[PDB]
Amino acid sequence: SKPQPIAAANWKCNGSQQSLSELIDLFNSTSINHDVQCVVASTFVHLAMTKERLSHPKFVIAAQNAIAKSGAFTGEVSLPILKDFGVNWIVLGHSERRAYYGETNEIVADKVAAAVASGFMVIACIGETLQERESGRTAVVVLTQIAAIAKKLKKADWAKVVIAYEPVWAIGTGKVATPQQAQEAHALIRSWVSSKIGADVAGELRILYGGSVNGKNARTLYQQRDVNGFLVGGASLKPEFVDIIKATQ
Amino acid sequence: SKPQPIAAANWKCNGSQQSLSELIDLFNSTSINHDVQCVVASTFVHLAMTKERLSHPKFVIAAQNAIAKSGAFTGEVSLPILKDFGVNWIVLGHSERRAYYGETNEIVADKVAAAVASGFMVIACIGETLQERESGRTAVVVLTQIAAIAKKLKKADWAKVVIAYEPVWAIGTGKVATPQQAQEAHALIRSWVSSKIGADVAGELRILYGGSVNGKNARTLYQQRDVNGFLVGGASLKPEFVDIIKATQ
């Protein structure tokens, strides 16, 4: 049987007070007649309002990044500061951070072990670029990514971890993977996990698909055996996100 | 004569709601009789609290970094997002961003130019490292850093810019910076402005000292001709900051 899904909204670097408040109203309004954990990842600035206005029993708030410790890191936000703030969910190793903000496999691994140590629920992002995929190198990349993370966690840690599989080619291009491409990537991951960590662990593990998920394609995606939920980008700024969540029935 | 001074508190990646609440109150009780602009640069996460609680007519809020546009930039915070939330001050190009976060002269320059466009008041940070000083490249480095910024701006835009000189060569290195040395870097920056941009602008320009400042040497540092105030690190988290503000009289 499938583990408890997740429907995660990554708002990225977007929104205004008014637009967001609107959205939040809508979600609080929604009747979620199934066991699904919904996560709202707002900008750092929006965390207070979000934490103030979000009322739904099925939603939690999350941060989009963090550094490990407090210190002489102008412009950054640490885990201790998020936690004193009452945030306990975090998104780490997003492909945008990887692509743009110099985050290496090692760096993501360090961030994830840290977060796990401070007691946060982590959504850890992994995935291959157009390039890699075209080169028939998807398995090596994905595996190398998860392996790096795994290297620093304790079997026990696994309970706090959520995997997000986000095909770099699939971001902001309209190009969603097929349910067969997603299922195969997802089964590859879980197989590493069962063999490497334990079936037990493999079995409780949430693997979220990311990359052009929309109102339309999510039901079919969800149907795949190794798909446990979604990390949504642009459609999370829309009423459609409601449609996405429902698809997790 | 000197233009209006600025006393900027750079909290970096520090703070708990309690500890900051406690510091904000002290600030609030502070008696400041002269014409000084005080700036409080919190983490993005503390902006809301800060904004609500800080009531002193002489204090404004600032951000510690931003990206130019809203978009698919997970974990980052943009100018429009900050504008909407009512922050109109920002610190850009901090030594730490330059060192660990890949901010080149060109990136910093882009950030400044966009912030300016958006009507923000900008504290733009420049400074040479131990090796550049030692290698005799102080002038070259410094002047390249300001020029990079100047090229994207119009003369009228200057009204919105504050320069922060950080003697990076003296931070964490074991070296000691003297008022005289501080003055020499400030004189160099002003001269370039005076010359390239104009004397009028140069005369109005605020140049802040971004080195190590405590209650103890602030007065001395302020004694210097071309020192217009401070961008404060560690001491800004302390009651001692009130002594630094006083030092600008």
UniProtKB/Swiss-Prot annotation, chains A, B:
Binding site for substrate: N10, K12
Location relative to the cell: Glycosome
This protein's UniProt keywords: Gluconeogenesis, Glycolysis, Glycosome, Isomerase, Peroxisome
Pfam family, one: TIM
E.C. number: 5.3.1.1
Main location as per UniProt: other
Entry GO terms, CC: cytoplasm; cytosol; glycosome
Subunit relationships: Homodimer.
Family: Belongs to the triosephosphate isomerase family.
Note: The enzyme contains a high proportion of positively-charged residues in beta-barrels V and VII (compared to the homologous regions in other triose isomerase sequences). Since 2 clusters of positive charges located at precise distances on the molecular surface are common to 4 glycosomal enzymes, it has been speculated that this might represent a signal for entry into glycosomes.
Name listed for the protein in its UniProt record: Triosephosphate isomerase, glycosomal
Organism: Trypanosoma brucei brucei
